[PDB]
Amino acid sequence: HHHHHHMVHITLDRNTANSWLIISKDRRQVRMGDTHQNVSDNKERFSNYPMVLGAQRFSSGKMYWEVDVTQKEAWDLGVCRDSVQRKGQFSLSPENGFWTIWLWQDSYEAGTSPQTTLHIQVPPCQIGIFVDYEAGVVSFYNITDHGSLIYTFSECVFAGPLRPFFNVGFNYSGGNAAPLKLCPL
Ligand SMILES: Cc1cccc(C(=O)N2CCC(C(N)=O)CC2)c1
């Protein structure tokens, strides 16, 4: 792809994080902690899942960023509406304000309703995310495989400002402790 020139510097918003997440000093990395991380609760925090938002809000233009997923067993990545539900159980779908892909149990799926099987020959270590607000597009690229296309959501109805979206996953197995990292420009 040729989207690299729309690169944006994303940082994580601590206030939105599940209370078990550890966000680095530079706000560019996040991982699951092994306990509650000693923060106060607030209405922004994702309660049920190890999720966090980027600080940046997008309402126009073209944006691109990259995330390192090396050696993780499970994660979700993409964008979401600023007003998505934070508390309780919910599915990742465009109807609920999410445009995402994930890894779970050795398969990659797009967060459509119902979910769509992805066809990835080279397991990615870094993912590129492209948003074209005006066109209503969210695309995902396999940086490990020369930028090959993973998935495009088109005809998106964003219906609000967008925020970068992250889920480090569940780490019941002891094999999913590694961080998500925002990769440098
Ligand atoms: C619902 C939810 C929210 C946040 C984190 C998790 C999670 O993956 N673990 C890893 C395993 C750990 C444990 N077994 O003590 C409990 C936290 C689950």
Side-chain angles (χ1 to χ4, degrees), residues 1-184:
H1 64 85
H2 304 293
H3 296 312
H4 307 93
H5 63 108
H6 298 298
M7 181 75 78
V8 288
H9 183 84
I10 299 309
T11 59
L12 299 173
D13 180 350
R14 301 187 167 285
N15 288 329
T16 71
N18 177 279
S19 60
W20 286 47
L21 297 181
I22 302 174
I23 290 165
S24 63
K25 183 156 53 171
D26 65 4
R27 300 186 305 109
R28 299 275 283 171
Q29 313 188 16
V30 57
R31 66 188 182 85
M32 171 154 329
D34 285 338
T35 192
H36 186 289
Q37 290 308 128
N38 205 25
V39 292
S40 57
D41 207 356
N42 70 49
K43 66 159 180 214
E44 304 179 57
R45 299 199 183 287
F46 285 102
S47 56
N48 287 49
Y49 314 104
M51 292 166 179
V52 61
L53 305 185
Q56 290 71 38
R57 273 59 146 9
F58 302 122
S59 289
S60 69
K62 294 177 179 179
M63 288 69 54
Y64 179 76
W65 62 99
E66 291 178 356
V67 187
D68 195 300
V69 299
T70 300
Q71 70 135 147
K72 292 190 67 53
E73 295 176 347
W75 49 260
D76 319 326
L77 290 173
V79 291
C80 64
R81 288 188 201 132
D82 63 350
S83 56
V84 292
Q85 177 184 349
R86 307 305 170 84
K87 306 304 182 179
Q89 302 190 105
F90 55 87
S91 52
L92 296 180
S93 62
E95 304 97 276
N96 286 343
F98 298 90
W99 299 266
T100 63
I101 68 167
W102 65 78
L103 172 61
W104 174 251
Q105 298 190 169
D106 199 38
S107 77
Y108 298 92
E109 296 174 330
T112 54
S113 188
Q115 66 254 65
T116 301
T117 296
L118 304 173
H119 302 97
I120 294 186
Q121 179 64 17
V122 177
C125 297
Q126 301 88 33
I127 300 291
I129 303 175
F130 178 68
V131 181
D132 182 339
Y133 196 100
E134 276 76 21
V137 168
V138 185
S139 296
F140 299 81
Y141 296 91
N142 183 342
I143 305 316
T144 306
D145 183 47
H146 308 293
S148 57
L149 180 66
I150 295 168
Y151 193 80
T152 294
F153 292 89
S154 69
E155 311 190 292
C156 298
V157 178
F158 297 132
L162 291 175
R163 298 182 69 174
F165 174 79
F166 308 88
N167 186 355
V168 300
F170 309 154
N171 187 35
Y172 294 111
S173 65
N176 199 35
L180 295 172
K181 307 188 194 173
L182 282 154
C183 309

